[PDB]
Design a protein around this ligand. Structure first.
Ligand SMILES: [Mg+2]
Length: 1047
C-alpha cells in the first residue's frame, strides 16, 4: 500500500571519473628521470589530481603498461640503479624492461576464501573498496576478479603492512599470483573517484537508461566541463595519466545531445536538470543557470524539473553558491514560460525559512504539488552578512551527524535503530514545517555515502514521498555476497536495483515515471491528447448502432486541429532538403517517429494501390513510407519531386484519389498513441492508458470512424471485391481442401484454427488464412515427433448483409466493443456465420435447416459429456471471435434451456490456446477455458487489452529481457522464463495467463511482436508439453486437463 518514487542522480558535482585502464602507480625512478622543471610540473599536476606520495613497501600487479625510455628526450647514478632494480636495462640512451610479469592469459582472481582468512572485517572492506575502485569486479562466488587484457593495480605499504600483520598467508597468495614489491613513488588511491562515473553525454545517457530500467522515475542530471582537460605523459608508461578538474558546469552542447536522446529512448522519464553553480560561486547570477532549460528535440519538450534553492548554499567542506532574490525571480519567471517545475533543494534551515515564508506564494504559483529535496547529513554553514562568522545551519546538526556516523560503524542492529531515531527526530521538524506551509507538496530524501543504510528506514518513519540514490550521493553499494558487505557501485542502476529490492523486502512498491507524471501533474502531450479524445467521447456508447462516424468526428474537431499542427511541423521538416535510394524511407520513418507519428504497417495497405495485382506484398515497407511523405506534402503545396523516386524501385505510387483526408490520418494517430515503441524499439511506453475506465469504449469509437472513412476510400479503388460468408479449409499431411457444406470435416479434424483480423474472404485474405493454418500445423506436427494430422482453418466473412466490406478496422472495432461489454451479450454477423455452422450443432440434436447465406433458421443432457473435445487455436482477434461464439451458445443454450450448470459442462468440452490475445478475456463469463500466451512487446495486442499481467515491470522477467537484448541471438531465443498465472472465473472459466513473455525480432529488439510465427517459433519446450498433452488425450474434460497441468 505504501509506495515511493525513486530519483536517480548519475553525475553530480563532486565525484570524478577514474579510468581503470590507467596506471595506478608511478615509481619514483620514472619521475626522477625527468628534467627538474618538467619533473616538478608533472608531480604537482599529479598531486593536484589525487596522486599521493608514498614510500616503498607496497605491492603491484602490472602487465602491459611498459614503454621504452629514450634519455635523449631529456644518465643519473641514483636513478640508474633504481631502473635496473625495477627491471630496466640500458642500451645506450634507450632503456626498456626485460623484467617480465605473469600475463593475463587467465584472469587474476582473489577468492572469497582468501579474503575471509583475514581477521579484520574493516581491512577486508577497504581492500574490496580499493580493488573495485580500480576496476576489479565481484563475482557471484563473492570473489574479486580482473577481466581486461591490461592490469596495473597497486596497494599502499599501509595495506601491505596491515595485510601482513592480520595474516601473512593472504599476502603470500598475491606474491604467488604475480604481485611484487615496489619502491617509493606516487599512487592513485582514487579517493572520491569511480570507474563508473559518467562525465560525457553518451555516458550520462547510458547511466540514465540503466537507472530507469531498474525502477527510477526521475533522473537528476549534471554536466562536467572539459575546458582544462589534459593528459600527462609519464616515461616508461604506454598509457598517459588523465588530469582535469572535471568541474561541475552547465554544458549546453552536452544537453543538446543528452536531452533529445533521452526524449527518444525514454519518453516517459521525468528529467530533472541541475541549475547548481557549485564549483563556480562567481557565476551565481549567470543566465547560464537556466540556458539549458529550453525545448529539445522535434517534439519540442522541455525538462520537467529544475533545481531551485531559496537562499545561499554554503558547504562546511568548502565551496557552494549563492542564490540572490532578483536572480531567483528571473529563474521562476523563465521556469514558467518554458514549463519547468522547480524542485526545492533543501540544503539549509535558512532554505526552509525562506521557503515557508517569503517564497511560499511564488513557489505555489510555480506549480503544484511543490517538490522538495532534503539534502540530509550534508554539513552546511550560515554566514552572518555583517561579521562573517559561520554557524551550523545543517538539517542534521554536525554533532548529531558525527554521532550517527559512529553508530553506523558499530554495525549492530541496536546502533542502527538509534541512528534512525537520531536522523528522524532531527528531520521531522523540517518535514512537518514544509507540509504545514504547503498543502500540496512532495518531499524526497537523499543521504551521502555511509548514511545510505538509513535511507529506507528514515524515509518510512517520516512518511516521505520519494527516495534519491546515485553516484552523486554515494559511490558504493551494499552487497551481502561480498566480504565486508560493500563494494563499488557499477553505475546508478546498481544502486537503484539495491533500493528497489530493499523496498520489495518490506512490501513497499515503487512508482514508475509514467504514473508519477499523473501524480505530479506533468503528463506527456500525446497522453494528454488521447485523454482529451476519451473525454470528448465519454458520453457516447461503444455500440456502432447507436452512434455515427459523423458525430464521432464532430466531437474530435478540436483534436483534429491539434493533430494537424503536429503534422505541419512534420511536413515542413521533410521539406527541408536528403537521399536517393529507397533508404529515403528510413529518413521519413525516423522523422515520423520523432514527431510521435507512427507510420503503421497495414496488411491491407495495398487497397489504396491501383496496380496492386502486379506488386509483391513483401516489399511494401519502403513504398508506404514514400507515399506517406507525398500524402503530407501534396495538400500543403510542398514538392514531392524528390519522392516518386519509387520509380527507381520494384507502380508503387499511390494515386491522389486514394490519399487519406486529414481526419482519417488523425484517427490513425490517436489509436497509435497507446502502447508506443521508443525510438529504437527497446521498450514500450504509454502503457497506463489501457487502465482507463473508458479506454476500450474510446478505442471502439475511434476505429468506428476509422472504418467508415477507410471503407469510403476503398469503394473508389480497384481493391479486390470480397465474398460473403466464411471459408472452411482442411489441412492434412501439407494437404489443402475447401469444404462447403460438410459438418463431417469438424469430426475428422484434430484442431480448429479460428480466423485472425486480416484473414477475410478475398484473394489476399485466403492466402494469409492458409499461411497461418500451415504455420499452426507444422507447429503441432513438429510436437508429434517428441517426448494423420488434420487441421481446420476458418476464414472470416469478407462482406456483411448490407454489402459493406469487411476490413481490419471492422474487426478492431468489434474487438474493442467486446471489451466494453459488461454482460455476455455482444457478437457480430461475422461471428454468427462461424458459430452457427461450428458450435450450434453441438447444442441441438442432428442436422437442421441452413439459409442460402449459410446462416441458420435439443438438450440431450446425457450426451453433453459425450461431445468430443474441441481444441482451438487463436491468434490476434481470435480470442475475441471465440468469446463471441460462447455468447451465442449461451443464448441458444438458454433458449433450449440447459440449467446453466450443464452449459458449464458444454464449455468443458471445448478448449482454447491463444497466441497474442488482442482482446480481453472476460474471466467471469460463461465460456471456453483458455491458455493465454501474449508477448509484452506485442503492442498491437497490448493496445487491444487491459490486463496488467501483460505488462513487464522491474523484476526477474525484466532481467531476462535486458539480458536477451544484448547476448541472445534471435533464432535461439525461447521464452522458458515465462510464468503461468492461473485464474478461475465466477462461472467456471479457467485462464492460464503466461507472464514475462516477449518476442525478439531479427535485430534482437522488440519490433514485430505480433508475428504468429515468432510466437510459435520462440515457444519453450515446456509449453509444447502442454499442447502435446492436449493432442494426445482421450475423451477427457478441459477443466480436468489443465488442472492436472498445474502440477
Ligand atoms: Mg544535485
Amino acid at each position: 500500500v505504501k509506495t515511493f518514487y525513486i530519483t536517480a542522480a548519475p553525475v553530480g558535482a563532486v565525484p570524478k571519473f577514474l579510468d581503470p585502464l590507467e596506471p595506478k602507480f608511478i615509481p619514483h625512478a620514472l619521475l626522477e628521470l625527468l628534467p627538474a622543471d618538467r619533473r616538478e610540473a608533472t608531480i604537482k599536476a599529479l598531486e593536484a589530481n589525487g596522486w599521493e606520495a608514498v614510500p616503498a613497501g607496497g605491492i603491484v600487479r602490472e602487465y602491459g603498461y611498459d614503454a621504452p625510455i629514450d634519455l635523449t628526450d631529456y644518465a643519473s647514478a641514483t636513478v640508474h640503479d633504481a631502473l635496473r632494480n625495477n627491471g630496466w636495462t640500458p642500451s645506450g640512451s634507450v632503456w626498456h624492461r626485460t623484467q617480465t610479469s605473469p600475463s593475463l592469459a587467465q584472469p587474476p582472481l582473489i577468492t572469497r576464501n582468501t579474503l575471509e582468512r583475514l581477521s579484520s572485517v574493516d581491512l577486508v572492506r577497504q581492500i574490496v573498496l580499493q580493488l573495485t575502485t580500480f576496476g576489479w569486479t565481484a563475482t557471484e562466488d563473492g570473489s574479486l576478479t580482473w577481466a581486461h587484457d591490461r592490469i596495473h593495480t597497486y596497494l599502499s605499504p599501509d595495506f601491505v603492512e596491515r595485510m601482513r600483520a592480520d595474516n601473512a598467508a593472504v599476502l603470500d597468495s598475491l606474491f604467488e599470483n604475480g604481485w611484487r614489491m615496489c619502491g617509493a613513488g606516487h599512487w592513485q588511491p582514487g579517493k572520491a573517484r569511480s570507474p563508473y562515473l559518467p562525465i560525457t553525454a553518451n555516458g550520462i545517457v547510458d547511466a540514465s537508461r540503466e537507472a530507469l530500467r531498474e525502477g527510477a522515475a526521475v533522473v537528476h542530471l549534471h554536466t562536467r566541463a572539459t575546458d582544462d582537460q589534459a593528459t600527462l605523459a609519464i616515461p616508461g608508461l604506454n598509457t598517459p595519466i588523465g588530469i582535469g578538474s572535471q568541474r561541475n558546469h552547465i554544458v549546453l552542447d552536452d544537453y543538446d545531445r543528452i536531452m533529445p536522446t533521452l526524449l527518444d529512448l525514454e519518453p516517459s522519464a521525468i528529467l530533472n536538470l541541475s541549475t547548481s553553480a557549485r564549483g563556480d560561486r562567481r557565476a551565481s547570477q549567470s543566465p547560464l543557470r537556466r540556458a539549458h532549460l529550453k525545448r529539445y528535440g522535434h517534439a519540442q519538450l522541455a525538462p520537467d524539473v529544475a533545481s531551485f534553492s531559496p537562499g545561499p548554499v554554503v558547504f562546511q567542506a568548502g565551496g557552494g553558491y549563492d542564490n540572490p532574490n532578483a536572480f531567483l525571480a528571473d529563474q521562476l519567471a523563465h521556469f514558467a514560460e518554458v514549463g519547468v517545475r522547480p524542485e526545492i533543494e533543501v540544503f539549509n534551515h535558512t532554505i526552509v525559512e525562506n521557503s515557508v515564508t517569503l517564497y511560499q506564494s511564488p513557489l505555489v504559483k510555480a506549480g503544484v504539488p511543490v517538490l522538495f529535496m532534503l539534502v540530509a547529513a550534508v554539513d552546511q554553514y550560515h554566514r552572518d552578512p555583517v561579521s562573517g562568522d559561520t554557524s551550523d545551519d545543517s538539517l542534521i546538526d554536525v554533532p548529531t551527524r558525527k554521532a550517527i556516523a559512529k553508530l553506523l560503524q558499530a554495525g549492530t542492529d541496536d546502533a542502527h535503530e538509534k541512528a534512525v531515531e537520531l536522523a528522524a527526530t532531527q528531520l521531522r521538524p523540517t518535514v512537518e514545517k514544509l507540509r504545514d506551509n504547503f498543502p500540496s507538496c512532495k518531499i524526497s530524501l537523499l543521504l551521502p555515502g555511509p548514511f545510505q543504510a538509513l535511507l529506507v528506514d528514515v524515509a518510512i518513519a517520516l512518511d516521505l514521498d520519494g527516495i534519491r540514490v546515485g553516484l552523486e550521493d554515494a559511490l558504493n553499494v551494499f552487497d551481502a555476497r561480498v566480504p565486508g558487505g560493500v563494494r563499488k557501485a557499477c553505475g546508478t542502476g546498481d544502486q537503484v536495483r539495491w533500493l528497489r529490492r530493499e523496498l520489495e523486502r518490506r512490501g513497499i512498491g515503487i512508482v514508475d515515471a509514467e504514473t508519477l507524471r499523473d501524480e505530479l501533474g506533468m503528463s506527456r502531450p500525446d497522453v494528454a491528447l488521447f485523454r482529451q479524445a476519451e473525454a470528448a467521447l465519454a458520453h457516447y456508447p461503444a455500440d456502432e448502432r447507436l452512434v455515427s462516424a459523423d458525430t464521432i468526428l464532430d466531437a474530435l474537431h478540436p483534436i483534429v486541429d491539434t493533430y494537424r499542427k503536429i503534422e505541419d511541423r512534420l511536413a515542413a521538416h521533410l521539406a527541408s532538403a536528403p537521399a536517393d535510394p529507397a533508404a529515403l524511407a528510413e529518413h521519413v520513418l525516423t522523422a515520423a517517429r520523432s514527431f510521435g507519428i507512427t507510420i503503421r504497417s497495414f496488411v491491407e495497405e495495398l487497397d489504396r494501390y491501383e496496380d496492386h495485382e502486379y506488386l509483391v506484398a513483401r516489399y511494401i515497407q519502403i513504398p508506404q513510407a514514400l507515399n506517406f511523405a507525398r500524402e503530407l506534402l501534396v495538400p500543403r503545396g510542398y514538392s514531392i519531386e524528390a519522392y516518386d523516386r519509387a520509380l527507381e524501385d520494384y507502380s508503387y505510387s499511390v494515386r491522389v484519389d486514394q490519399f487519406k483526408p486529414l481526419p482519417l490520418r488523425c484517427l490513425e494517430y490517436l489509436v497509435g498513441i497507446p502502447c508506443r515503441y521508443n525510438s529504437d524499439y527497446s521498450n514500450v511506453v504509454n502503457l497506463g492508458l489501457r487502465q482507463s475506465p473508458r479506454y476500450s469504449a474510446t478505442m471502439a469509437l475511434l476505429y468506428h470512424a476509422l472504418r467508415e472513412l477507410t471503407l469510403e476510400l476503398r469503394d473508389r479503388s480497384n481493391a479486390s471485391r470480397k465474398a460473403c460468408g466464411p471459408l472452411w479449409t482442411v489441412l492434412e499431411t501439407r494437404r489443402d481442401v475447401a469444404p462447403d457444406e460438410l459438418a463431417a470435416a469438424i469430426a475428422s479434424v484434430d484442431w480448429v484454427v479460428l480466423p485472425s483480423t486480416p484473414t477475410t474472404n478475398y484473394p489476399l485474405g485466403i492466402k494469409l488464412s492458409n499461411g497461418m493454418a500451415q504455420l499452426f500445423h507444422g507447429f503441432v506436427a513438429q510436437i508429434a515427433a517428441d517426448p494423420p494430422l488434420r487441421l481446420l482453418a476458418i476464414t472470416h466473412s469478407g462482406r456483411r448483409d448490407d454489402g459493406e466490406t469487411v476490413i481490419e478496422a471492422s474487426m478492431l472495432h468489434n474487438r474493442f466493443a467486446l471489451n466494453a461489454d459488461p454482460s455476455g451479450i455482444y457478437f457480430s454477423e461475422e461471428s454468427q456465420l462461424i458459430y452457427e455452422r461450428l458450435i450450434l450443432p453441438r447444442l441441438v440434436d442432428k442436422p437442421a435447416k441452413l439459409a442460402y447465406t449459410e446462416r441458420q433458421l435439443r438438450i440431450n443432457a446425457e450426451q453433453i459429456e459425450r461431445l468430443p473435445l474441441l481444441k482451438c487455436f487463436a491468434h490476434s482477434s481470435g480470442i475475441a471471435t471465440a468469446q463471441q461464439l460462447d455468447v451465442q451458445a449461451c443464448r441458444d443454450g438458454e433458449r433450449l434451456g440447459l440449467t446453466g450448470d450443464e452449459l458449464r459442462a458444454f464449455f468443458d468440452r471445448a478448449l482454447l490456446v491463444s497466441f497474442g490475445s488482442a482482446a480481453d478475456i472476460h474471466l467471469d463469463w460463461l465460456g471456453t477455458s483458455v491458455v493465454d500466451v501474449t508477448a509484452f512487446n506485442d503492442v498491437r495486442s497490448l493496445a487491444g487489452t487491459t490486463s496488467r499481467h501483460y505488462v513487464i515491470q522491474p523484476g526477474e522477467h525484466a532481467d531476462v529481457l535486458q539480458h536477451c537484448l544484448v547476448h541472445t541471438q534471435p533464432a535461439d531465443y525461447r521464452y522458458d522464463h515465462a510464468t503461468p498465472v492461473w485464474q478461475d472465473g465466477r462461472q467456471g472459466k479457467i485462464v492460464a495467463r503466461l507472464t514475462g513473455v516477449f518476442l525478439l525480432d531479427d535485430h534482437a529488439r522488440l519490433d514485430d511482436g505480433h508475428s504468429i510465427r515468432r510466437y510459435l517459433a520462440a515457444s519453450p519446450l515446456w509449453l509444447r508439453q502442454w499442447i502435446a498433452r492436449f493432442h494426445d488425450a482421450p475423451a477427457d474434460t478441459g477443466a480436468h486437463a489443465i488442472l492436472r497441468e498445474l502440477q
